[PDB]
Amino acid sequence: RAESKSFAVGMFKGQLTIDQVFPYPSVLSEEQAQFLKELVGPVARFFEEVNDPAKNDALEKVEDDTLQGLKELGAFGLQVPSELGGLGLSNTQYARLAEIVGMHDLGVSVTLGAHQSIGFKGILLYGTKAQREKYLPRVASGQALAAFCLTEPSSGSDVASIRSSAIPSPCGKYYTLNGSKIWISNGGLADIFTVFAKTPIKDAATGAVKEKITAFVVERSFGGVTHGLPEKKMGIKASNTSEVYFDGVKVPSENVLGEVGDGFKVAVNILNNGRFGMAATLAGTMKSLIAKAVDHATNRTQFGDKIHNFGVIQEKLARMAILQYVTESMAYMLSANMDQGFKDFQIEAAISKIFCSEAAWKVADECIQIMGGMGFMKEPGVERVLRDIRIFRIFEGANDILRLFVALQGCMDKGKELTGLGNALKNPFGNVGLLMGEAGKQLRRRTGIGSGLSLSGIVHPELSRSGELAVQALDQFATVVEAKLVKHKKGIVNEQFLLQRLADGAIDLYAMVVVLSRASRSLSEGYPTAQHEKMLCDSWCIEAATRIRENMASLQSSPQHQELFRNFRSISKAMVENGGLVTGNPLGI
Amino acid sequence: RAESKSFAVGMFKGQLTIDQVFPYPSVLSEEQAQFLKELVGPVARFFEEVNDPAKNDALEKVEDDTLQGLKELGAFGLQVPSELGGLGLSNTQYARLAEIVGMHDLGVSVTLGAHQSIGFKGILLYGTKAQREKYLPRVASGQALAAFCLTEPSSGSDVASIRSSAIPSPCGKYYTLNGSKIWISNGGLADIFTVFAKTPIKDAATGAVKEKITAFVVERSFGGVTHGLPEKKMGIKASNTSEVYFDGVKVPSENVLGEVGDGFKVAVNILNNGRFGMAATLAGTMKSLIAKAVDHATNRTQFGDKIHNFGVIQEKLARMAILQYVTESMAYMLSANMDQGFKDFQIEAAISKIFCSEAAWKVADECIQIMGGMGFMKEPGVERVLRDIRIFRIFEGANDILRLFVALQGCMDKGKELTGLGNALKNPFGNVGLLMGEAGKQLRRRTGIGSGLSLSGIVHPELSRSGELAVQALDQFATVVEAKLVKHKKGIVNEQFLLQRLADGAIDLYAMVVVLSRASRSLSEGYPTAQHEKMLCDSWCIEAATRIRENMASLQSSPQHQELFRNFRSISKAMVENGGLVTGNPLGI
Ligand SMILES: Cc1cc2nc3c(=O)[nH]c(=O)nc-3n(C[C@H](O)[C@H](O)[C@H](O)COP(=O)(O)OP(=O)(O)OC[C@H]3O[C@@H](n4cnc5c(N)ncnc54)[C@H](O)[C@@H]3O)c2cc1C
Ligand SMILES: Cc1cc2nc3c(=O)[nH]c(=O)nc-3n(C[C@H](O)[C@H](O)[C@H](O)COP(=O)(O)OP(=O)(O)OC[C@H]3O[C@@H](n4cnc5c(N)ncnc54)[C@H](O)[C@@H]3O)c2cc1C
């Protein structure tokens, strides 16, 4: 059975599946690129002639007749098959536009994000020809917007808990649908509500019924769909976002999307098929933060000098730069992997969401800090974009959950190979090649040889110094997984403190290797910036190898860290019991 | 000459001047306390019956007739001599009220902060009897507000650059004053503008003139003072904040405050005499964040459970708790040191500002993260208090500057003792006791003895485990200073990258020892929470000893860190040259 092409999955097994990762990918046909040249121009000039971010914020919705203009560029159909009404773009052409719009206004660009990153996305990802023909030409025009109605009060971050749910009619010719969904994008505006809901089914093991989760397409034309007024939120304000209510809505059963009960797989497939766009948009946003910053820090005097001459400004600026270049270099790589058409990349997707969402927030905060008083005002716009970033660590799955998902979904196949232990011990002689070099891991790991991994020939020689770091990290990272997995078995899923820290380890490690790949590309092709990219990549790899070391080491052994986890359980418990901070002030009064 | 009682100054010399720090201080007379008990009640109940934070934000000023009510409690005169119209409070009684108001609305409480933490503060800290009698009874009533008009466009965070400046009249009977000041609190409302400006003086070495900096008191009753409309800012919005302009304002010369040219010392004295209030207010704010947090995390289900049962929630909550308890335990300690009346504590002051301002922001961000979607809305208020915190890392001196100040002002006296080297080598025999145990440092440090430091008897025995950590940290921290100081001499002031990291080291180390002191108090007196405080203190000390290790070690030796600092200088330079992010996207387009 073929090895999972996922680099991260390989990395959990301590294997080195570079092949989704090297050379840093290129995917454009010469027409696909050339087409892109013709699109970049007018769209970006739109976002200086036409748009106005501050006014968009003030109105708490898009400029309606500026929004309209996007319909005419087909902005609501960028990924649709061209003759069915779209631009037919590959993932990576689309991602470039996502970078552009992310440079300018998160609000509009996330209204799109809802509408086309995930909104109708099921119609492409499973819809039949009849489904596409019916709905898609409407949606692509942006005459009809769509929304991904997962979340409801009871619980949103656990899909299995959704109580909003649906009765097949007795003639079977339609499903019937009920429930609230809360915080749905374009809930005021959309026509094509995708809705995810529970439904009974007669089972295929006994003919008893069980309850399973289904995804659906619902036009507001059905009647009985209704939505609240918009909520008030920290930013993104030009985006419409509301509840949606279902008055027993009827749904002709050929509007089952995918197949009844496949819905949960659909939901995770859509969200993973969308996440790359977020990293693209934040890449753009960061590009415009860092520009705004360096310009201010170019002009401001202090202490008789331009402040960019002072070390702490240089460090802040360099970090923000590295974070942008990493995010960009990851986003384009995931889009390219999809356009090539690898099928498995679930971890890389989740990692890209986590890293881009947190890193943009780090950058924007530093930006305000360098910008000082100037920065804090409503005039310079940085303030709005900061407020707008903080949302991204939450929606489209909160990063804490996504961390746990990364770690668990990762160490599925490690668990498989450990099961390979129990199998092989019970066929040592009949089977051949059963464990050849498997204990060799300990031959490598106990006696302190090189593990046998290298980036030789894989990375441009000059980088290989920093490239060496990745091997070190990898050897250390995969090592701890084995131990901490084995000790805890499938009980691991309750070792949350540990799982989180493995999530952060995986994040930094994969972020490392991505940049090291792109750097190798730019070095070899010799673009004039290639030495600059070398300098960035090296700085990142040095820091990331440091953090990974102190994570892995502090996690593997320290009794004091077990004292910490004990303390956190104790202290959290005490806070919960008291329902508050336990201790009075030193005065008692 | 007496040893500086400053613990931090001692710490720079690697000495252990616990005596400003142990036992954890108590300062209240039984009337001072009892008075406080009578004040806590009605004020806090005011901040539930009367105030409304959301409306305050909406109006972008205080509820005018709610503001009025504070005048009647004397809120604008809490520190004024009672018979001159104040409450006569010690620092620590005032600090308790600061904790209360910080629990509820940063806006009002910083309008006070401007008015009385620093505003009139020069009138107490140097004003003559005639000055106090004249101005103070007006100000204490809050009929007249006051402002600390340091900052102006040209430059604000460097006091020496202020161009706003003043001519002594030829009769000498008044000074005459000119310039703008920008971002001045209560600039719309205040009557008693303190203003800080340059002025010529005939020198006392030749009778040639030089230019020096003076502080002044200015009533708007003088005429010729004017101010802009209010600016728009991310929060705190109920605070008024504006420019102020000076139309050649005349100032009768007995309104020199302190003495002409002493102004810069006055400015730093005021700001240091104020900073403790900020740590108090944020302590309160954090107390109400963490309460809001634990309550939401007490009720929310997910995955079939209350989420507080899941490890990552427990860790977040425990950290937020530790950060609150540290901030509180520091603020009250600085206030107590002032009420006792130690004179030198400049570093502890700056540290308290840095740590409280950053730590509250860490807490508020985690609070939003646990609060998820619920958290992001305008309904629960957390979003406003988050926006309101981000300002504190900037104003009253930006933390980056304050870091550099901490490190430099610290290693002044180390430089003195190294000069003691050059002196002693040129009197080895005449002088006695010249260097006895001084090379003993290397006897201790090379051969790896204990340095001779301990907390034995100083800290409660059970803590001494975590107490041991401080000695380790201290030995490591002071060690690097010596080396990095010596190598760089007074050129050190240009080794910014290094100085910053020493600032962070000092921060964590002193924060540790503070909590270890308070914990020892609570243990010995045996308050029912004392085991809880033990658990907090231990967790903090373990983490802080870890971060200090990796700071000191990574800074002292790694060539790769010198490669980093090289890279940052190179990369920052490239960004400045290009005035932007250097590299195109992987597509070139
Ligand atoms: C709501 C609000 C209220 C305010 N109220 C007051 C008030 O009551 N009184 C008052 O005096 N001010 C007030 N201010 C102004 C605020 O305190 C200013 O940030 C500060 O006083 C001066 O900062 P600046 O912007 O002039 O610094 P800048 O000149 O803009 O420089 C600060 C930035 O440059 C960098 N920098 C500058 N010099 C150095 C150096 N030597 N080394 C390294 N980095 C350096 C820092 O990293 C920082 O990012 C207020 C501001 C706001 C937003
Ligand atoms: C502006 C905006 C737009 C939105 N648009 C959409 C949209 O288009 N589509 C959509 O589906 N949703 C949307 N949402 C909702 C958002 O995606 C939700 O945050 C998410 O869908 C579900 O989160 P929740 O609040 O229900 O999670 P909750 O049930 O509130 O739980 C999340 C919190 O609980 C903790 N937690 C939960 N489970 C665990 C666990 N197992 N272990 C440890 N900790 C745990 C986490 O630490 C986190 O802090 C939007 C929200 C906003 C604010």
PDB file of N, CA and C and ligand atoms in Angstrom, chain A residues 114 118 148-157 182-185 233 236 241 391 394-398 400-401 404 496, chain B residues 296 300-303 307 310-313 316 368-374 376-377, ligand 2:
ATOM      1  N   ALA A 114     -16.352  33.400   2.588  1.00  0.00           N
ATOM      2  CA  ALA A 114     -17.577  32.653   2.837  1.00  0.00           C
ATOM      3  C   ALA A 114     -18.219  32.206   1.528  1.00  0.00           C
ATOM      4  N   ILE A 118     -15.675  28.321   0.758  1.00  0.00           N
ATOM      5  CA  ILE A 118     -16.355  27.190   1.379  1.00  0.00           C
ATOM      6  C   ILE A 118     -17.837  27.153   1.029  1.00  0.00           C
ATOM      7  N   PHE A 148     -21.974  28.550   4.758  1.00  0.00           N
ATOM      8  CA  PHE A 148     -21.617  27.230   5.288  1.00  0.00           C
ATOM      9  C   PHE A 148     -22.126  27.108   6.723  1.00  0.00           C
ATOM     10  N   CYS A 149     -23.395  26.715   6.853  1.00  0.00           N
ATOM     11  CA  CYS A 149     -24.144  26.862   8.104  1.00  0.00           C
ATOM     12  C   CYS A 149     -23.876  25.724   9.096  1.00  0.00           C
ATOM     13  N   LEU A 150     -22.623  25.611   9.537  1.00  0.00           N
ATOM     14  CA  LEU A 150     -22.286  24.555  10.489  1.00  0.00           C
ATOM     15  C   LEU A 150     -22.830  24.866  11.880  1.00  0.00           C
ATOM     16  N   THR A 151     -22.549  26.065  12.384  1.00  0.00           N
ATOM     17  CA  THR A 151     -22.476  26.340  13.816  1.00  0.00           C
ATOM     18  C   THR A 151     -23.851  26.657  14.392  1.00  0.00           C
ATOM     19  N   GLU A 152     -24.124  26.129  15.579  1.00  0.00           N
ATOM     20  CA  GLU A 152     -25.362  26.385  16.296  1.00  0.00           C
ATOM     21  C   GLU A 152     -25.076  26.458  17.788  1.00  0.00           C
ATOM     22  N   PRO A 153     -25.971  27.088  18.560  1.00  0.00           N
ATOM     23  CA  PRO A 153     -25.695  27.393  19.973  1.00  0.00           C
ATOM     24  C   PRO A 153     -25.207  26.207  20.787  1.00  0.00           C
ATOM     25  N   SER A 154     -26.035  25.167  20.891  1.00  0.00           N
ATOM     26  CA  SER A 154     -25.679  23.936  21.588  1.00  0.00           C
ATOM     27  C   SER A 154     -24.201  23.617  21.433  1.00  0.00           C
ATOM     28  N   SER A 155     -23.739  23.336  20.220  1.00  0.00           N
ATOM     29  CA  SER A 155     -22.306  23.245  20.023  1.00  0.00           C
ATOM     30  C   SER A 155     -21.967  23.324  18.546  1.00  0.00           C
ATOM     31  N   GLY A 156     -20.887  24.046  18.255  1.00  0.00           N
ATOM     32  CA  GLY A 156     -20.459  24.292  16.896  1.00  0.00           C
ATOM     33  C   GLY A 156     -19.134  23.640  16.586  1.00  0.00           C
ATOM     34  N   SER A 157     -18.253  23.602  17.587  1.00  0.00           N
ATOM     35  CA  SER A 157     -16.906  23.098  17.379  1.00  0.00           C
ATOM     36  C   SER A 157     -16.841  21.588  17.507  1.00  0.00           C
ATOM     37  N   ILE A 182     -26.036  29.570  14.111  1.00  0.00           N
ATOM     38  CA  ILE A 182     -25.648  30.863  14.661  1.00  0.00           C
ATOM     39  C   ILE A 182     -24.285  31.269  14.121  1.00  0.00           C
ATOM     40  N   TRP A 183     -24.122  32.576  13.919  1.00  0.00           N
ATOM     41  CA  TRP A 183     -22.927  33.151  13.306  1.00  0.00           C
ATOM     42  C   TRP A 183     -22.671  32.585  11.908  1.00  0.00           C
ATOM     43  N   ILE A 184     -23.649  32.761  11.028  1.00  0.00           N
ATOM     44  CA  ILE A 184     -23.528  32.327   9.641  1.00  0.00           C
ATOM     45  C   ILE A 184     -23.246  33.537   8.764  1.00  0.00           C
ATOM     46  N   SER A 185     -22.180  33.447   7.969  1.00  0.00           N
ATOM     47  CA  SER A 185     -21.772  34.541   7.097  1.00  0.00           C
ATOM     48  C   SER A 185     -22.755  34.728   5.948  1.00  0.00           C
ATOM     49  N   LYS A 233     -19.786  43.139  16.065  1.00  0.00           N
ATOM     50  CA  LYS A 233     -18.548  42.370  16.194  1.00  0.00           C
ATOM     51  C   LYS A 233     -17.331  43.286  16.013  1.00  0.00           C
ATOM     52  N   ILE A 236     -14.243  43.306  10.706  1.00  0.00           N
ATOM     53  CA  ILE A 236     -14.733  42.538   9.581  1.00  0.00           C
ATOM     54  C   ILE A 236     -16.104  43.092   9.231  1.00  0.00           C
ATOM     55  N   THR A 241     -23.284  38.838   8.912  1.00  0.00           N
ATOM     56  CA  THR A 241     -23.119  37.647   9.736  1.00  0.00           C
ATOM     57  C   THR A 241     -24.281  37.612  10.712  1.00  0.00           C
ATOM     58  N   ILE A 391     -10.024  37.684  14.797  1.00  0.00           N
ATOM     59  CA  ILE A 391     -11.055  36.691  14.536  1.00  0.00           C
ATOM     60  C   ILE A 391     -10.494  35.382  13.979  1.00  0.00           C
ATOM     61  N   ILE A 394     -10.085  31.992  15.643  1.00  0.00           N
ATOM     62  CA  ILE A 394     -11.290  31.316  16.107  1.00  0.00           C
ATOM     63  C   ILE A 394     -12.022  30.583  14.987  1.00  0.00           C
ATOM     64  N   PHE A 395     -12.562  31.323  14.023  1.00  0.00           N
ATOM     65  CA  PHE A 395     -13.549  30.749  13.115  1.00  0.00           C
ATOM     66  C   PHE A 395     -12.849  29.903  12.059  1.00  0.00           C
ATOM     67  N   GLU A 396     -13.638  29.129  11.322  1.00  0.00           N
ATOM     68  CA  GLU A 396     -13.115  28.025  10.525  1.00  0.00           C
ATOM     69  C   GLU A 396     -12.302  27.085  11.410  1.00  0.00           C
ATOM     70  N   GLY A 397     -12.891  26.741  12.551  1.00  0.00           N
ATOM     71  CA  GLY A 397     -12.242  25.899  13.530  1.00  0.00           C
ATOM     72  C   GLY A 397     -11.223  26.649  14.359  1.00  0.00           C
ATOM     73  N   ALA A 398     -11.397  26.623  15.676  1.00  0.00           N
ATOM     74  CA  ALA A 398     -10.507  27.348  16.570  1.00  0.00           C
ATOM     75  C   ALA A 398      -9.146  26.662  16.603  1.00  0.00           C
ATOM     76  N   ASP A 400      -6.851  26.049  18.864  1.00  0.00           N
ATOM     77  CA  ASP A 400      -6.701  25.021  19.894  1.00  0.00           C
ATOM     78  C   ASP A 400      -7.233  23.650  19.452  1.00  0.00           C
ATOM     79  N   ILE A 401      -8.468  23.617  18.949  1.00  0.00           N
ATOM     80  CA  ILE A 401      -8.989  22.366  18.412  1.00  0.00           C
ATOM     81  C   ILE A 401      -8.112  21.898  17.269  1.00  0.00           C
ATOM     82  N   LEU A 404      -5.212  20.036  18.345  1.00  0.00           N
ATOM     83  CA  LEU A 404      -5.465  18.672  18.799  1.00  0.00           C
ATOM     84  C   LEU A 404      -5.709  17.749  17.609  1.00  0.00           C
ATOM     85  N   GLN A 496      -4.115  15.936  27.022  1.00  0.00           N
ATOM     86  CA  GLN A 496      -4.260  17.145  26.219  1.00  0.00           C
ATOM     87  C   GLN A 496      -3.018  18.024  26.303  1.00  0.00           C
TER      88      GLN A 496
ATOM     89  N   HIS B 296     -17.807  31.634  32.064  1.00  0.00           N
ATOM     90  CA  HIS B 296     -18.152  31.078  30.759  1.00  0.00           C
ATOM     91  C   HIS B 296     -17.632  29.654  30.615  1.00  0.00           C
ATOM     92  N   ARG B 300     -20.056  26.280  29.555  1.00  0.00           N
ATOM     93  CA  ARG B 300     -20.060  25.818  28.171  1.00  0.00           C
ATOM     94  C   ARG B 300     -19.834  24.309  28.104  1.00  0.00           C
ATOM     95  N   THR B 301     -20.755  23.591  27.463  1.00  0.00           N
ATOM     96  CA  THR B 301     -20.499  22.211  27.069  1.00  0.00           C
ATOM     97  C   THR B 301     -19.710  22.159  25.765  1.00  0.00           C
ATOM     98  N   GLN B 302     -18.914  21.099  25.617  1.00  0.00           N
ATOM     99  CA  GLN B 302     -18.540  20.578  24.308  1.00  0.00           C
ATOM    100  C   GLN B 302     -18.093  19.137  24.487  1.00  0.00           C
ATOM    101  N   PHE B 303     -18.112  18.382  23.386  1.00  0.00           N
ATOM    102  CA  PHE B 303     -17.666  16.989  23.413  1.00  0.00           C
ATOM    103  C   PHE B 303     -18.271  16.244  24.599  1.00  0.00           C
ATOM    104  N   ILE B 307     -16.115  22.167  29.319  1.00  0.00           N
ATOM    105  CA  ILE B 307     -14.794  22.269  28.713  1.00  0.00           C
ATOM    106  C   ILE B 307     -13.694  22.499  29.739  1.00  0.00           C
ATOM    107  N   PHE B 310     -11.074  19.937  30.225  1.00  0.00           N
ATOM    108  CA  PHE B 310     -10.097  19.630  29.187  1.00  0.00           C
ATOM    109  C   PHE B 310      -8.811  20.424  29.382  1.00  0.00           C
ATOM    110  N   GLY B 311      -7.690  19.719  29.228  1.00  0.00           N
ATOM    111  CA  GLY B 311      -6.399  20.233  29.663  1.00  0.00           C
ATOM    112  C   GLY B 311      -6.044  21.618  29.159  1.00  0.00           C
ATOM    113  N   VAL B 312      -6.263  21.881  27.869  1.00  0.00           N
ATOM    114  CA  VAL B 312      -5.848  23.174  27.318  1.00  0.00           C
ATOM    115  C   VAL B 312      -6.608  24.332  27.952  1.00  0.00           C
ATOM    116  N   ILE B 313      -7.851  24.101  28.355  1.00  0.00           N
ATOM    117  CA  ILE B 313      -8.570  25.121  29.100  1.00  0.00           C
ATOM    118  C   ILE B 313      -7.961  25.305  30.479  1.00  0.00           C
ATOM    119  N   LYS B 316      -4.676  27.347  30.063  1.00  0.00           N
ATOM    120  CA  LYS B 316      -4.929  28.765  29.825  1.00  0.00           C
ATOM    121  C   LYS B 316      -5.373  29.453  31.111  1.00  0.00           C
ATOM    122  N   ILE B 368     -10.241  36.011  25.211  1.00  0.00           N
ATOM    123  CA  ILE B 368     -10.966  35.902  23.945  1.00  0.00           C
ATOM    124  C   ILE B 368     -10.827  34.508  23.348  1.00  0.00           C
ATOM    125  N   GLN B 369      -9.623  33.939  23.385  1.00  0.00           N
ATOM    126  CA  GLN B 369      -9.430  32.634  22.756  1.00  0.00           C
ATOM    127  C   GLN B 369     -10.271  31.543  23.404  1.00  0.00           C
ATOM    128  N   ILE B 370     -10.286  31.474  24.733  1.00  0.00           N
ATOM    129  CA  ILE B 370     -11.172  30.505  25.374  1.00  0.00           C
ATOM    130  C   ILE B 370     -12.630  30.849  25.109  1.00  0.00           C
ATOM    131  N   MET B 371     -12.963  32.139  25.121  1.00  0.00           N
ATOM    132  CA  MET B 371     -14.338  32.560  24.914  1.00  0.00           C
ATOM    133  C   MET B 371     -14.842  32.314  23.502  1.00  0.00           C
ATOM    134  N   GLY B 372     -13.959  32.072  22.546  1.00  0.00           N
ATOM    135  CA  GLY B 372     -14.397  31.714  21.210  1.00  0.00           C
ATOM    136  C   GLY B 372     -15.373  32.705  20.597  1.00  0.00           C
ATOM    137  N   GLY B 373     -16.294  32.146  19.805  1.00  0.00           N
ATOM    138  CA  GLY B 373     -17.300  32.971  19.159  1.00  0.00           C
ATOM    139  C   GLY B 373     -18.040  33.831  20.158  1.00  0.00           C
ATOM    140  N   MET B 374     -18.465  33.229  21.268  1.00  0.00           N
ATOM    141  CA  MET B 374     -19.138  33.998  22.306  1.00  0.00           C
ATOM    142  C   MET B 374     -18.317  35.240  22.614  1.00  0.00           C
ATOM    143  N   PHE B 376     -16.100  36.884  20.882  1.00  0.00           N
ATOM    144  CA  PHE B 376     -15.791  37.905  19.884  1.00  0.00           C
ATOM    145  C   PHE B 376     -16.860  38.972  19.753  1.00  0.00           C
ATOM    146  N   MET B 377     -18.045  38.749  20.291  1.00  0.00           N
ATOM    147  CA  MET B 377     -19.125  39.691  20.080  1.00  0.00           C
ATOM    148  C   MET B 377     -19.007  40.910  20.986  1.00  0.00           C
TER     149      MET B 377
HETATM  150  C1  LIG C   2     -17.571  37.018  12.554  1.00  0.00           C
HETATM  151  C2  LIG C   2     -17.836  35.541  12.670  1.00  0.00           C
HETATM  152  C3  LIG C   2     -18.163  34.815  11.528  1.00  0.00           C
HETATM  153  C4  LIG C   2     -18.417  33.447  11.597  1.00  0.00           C
HETATM  154  N1  LIG C   2     -18.743  32.770  10.432  1.00  0.00           N
HETATM  155  C5  LIG C   2     -18.975  31.495  10.511  1.00  0.00           C
HETATM  156  C6  LIG C   2     -19.316  30.789   9.294  1.00  0.00           C
HETATM  157  O1  LIG C   2     -19.406  31.290   8.176  1.00  0.00           O
HETATM  158  N2  LIG C   2     -19.546  29.440   9.474  1.00  0.00           N
HETATM  159  C7  LIG C   2     -19.475  28.761  10.680  1.00  0.00           C
HETATM  160  O2  LIG C   2     -19.707  27.548  10.696  1.00  0.00           O
HETATM  161  N3  LIG C   2     -19.154  29.438  11.819  1.00  0.00           N
HETATM  162  C8  LIG C   2     -18.921  30.730  11.728  1.00  0.00           C
HETATM  163  N4  LIG C   2     -18.607  31.417  12.875  1.00  0.00           N
HETATM  164  C9  LIG C   2     -18.525  30.676  14.140  1.00  0.00           C
HETATM  165  C10 LIG C   2     -17.099  30.286  14.504  1.00  0.00           C
HETATM  166  O3  LIG C   2     -16.518  29.520  13.449  1.00  0.00           O
HETATM  167  C11 LIG C   2     -17.130  29.433  15.768  1.00  0.00           C
HETATM  168  O4  LIG C   2     -16.093  29.855  16.645  1.00  0.00           O
HETATM  169  C12 LIG C   2     -16.964  27.942  15.482  1.00  0.00           C
HETATM  170  O5  LIG C   2     -17.657  27.630  14.274  1.00  0.00           O
HETATM  171  C13 LIG C   2     -17.491  27.107  16.627  1.00  0.00           C
HETATM  172  O6  LIG C   2     -16.978  27.643  17.862  1.00  0.00           O
HETATM  173  P1  LIG C   2     -17.823  27.604  19.185  1.00  0.00           P
HETATM  174  O7  LIG C   2     -17.861  28.996  19.822  1.00  0.00           O
HETATM  175  O8  LIG C   2     -19.133  26.971  18.952  1.00  0.00           O
HETATM  176  O9  LIG C   2     -16.947  26.699  20.100  1.00  0.00           O
HETATM  177  P2  LIG C   2     -17.284  26.495  21.631  1.00  0.00           P
HETATM  178  O10 LIG C   2     -18.315  25.447  21.789  1.00  0.00           O
HETATM  179  O11 LIG C   2     -17.656  27.865  22.208  1.00  0.00           O
HETATM  180  O12 LIG C   2     -15.901  26.079  22.130  1.00  0.00           O
HETATM  181  C14 LIG C   2     -14.722  26.799  21.720  1.00  0.00           C
HETATM  182  C15 LIG C   2     -13.936  27.082  22.965  1.00  0.00           C
HETATM  183  O13 LIG C   2     -14.041  25.947  23.846  1.00  0.00           O
HETATM  184  C16 LIG C   2     -12.800  25.297  23.996  1.00  0.00           C
HETATM  185  N5  LIG C   2     -12.966  23.895  23.636  1.00  0.00           N
HETATM  186  C17 LIG C   2     -13.964  23.335  22.886  1.00  0.00           C
HETATM  187  N6  LIG C   2     -13.837  22.040  22.711  1.00  0.00           N
HETATM  188  C18 LIG C   2     -12.668  21.730  23.390  1.00  0.00           C
HETATM  189  C19 LIG C   2     -11.980  20.520  23.593  1.00  0.00           C
HETATM  190  N7  LIG C   2     -12.381  19.342  23.108  1.00  0.00           N
HETATM  191  N8  LIG C   2     -10.845  20.562  24.319  1.00  0.00           N
HETATM  192  C20 LIG C   2     -10.433  21.732  24.808  1.00  0.00           C
HETATM  193  N9  LIG C   2     -10.997  22.933  24.683  1.00  0.00           N
HETATM  194  C21 LIG C   2     -12.118  22.864  23.957  1.00  0.00           C
HETATM  195  C22 LIG C   2     -11.781  26.007  23.104  1.00  0.00           C
HETATM  196  O14 LIG C   2     -10.573  26.201  23.831  1.00  0.00           O
HETATM  197  C23 LIG C   2     -12.451  27.337  22.733  1.00  0.00           C
HETATM  198  O15 LIG C   2     -11.988  28.436  23.506  1.00  0.00           O
HETATM  199  C24 LIG C   2     -18.335  32.798  12.836  1.00  0.00           C
HETATM  200  C25 LIG C   2     -18.005  33.521  13.976  1.00  0.00           C
HETATM  201  C26 LIG C   2     -17.752  34.885  13.908  1.00  0.00           C
HETATM  202  C27 LIG C   2     -17.404  35.633  15.165  1.00  0.00           C
END
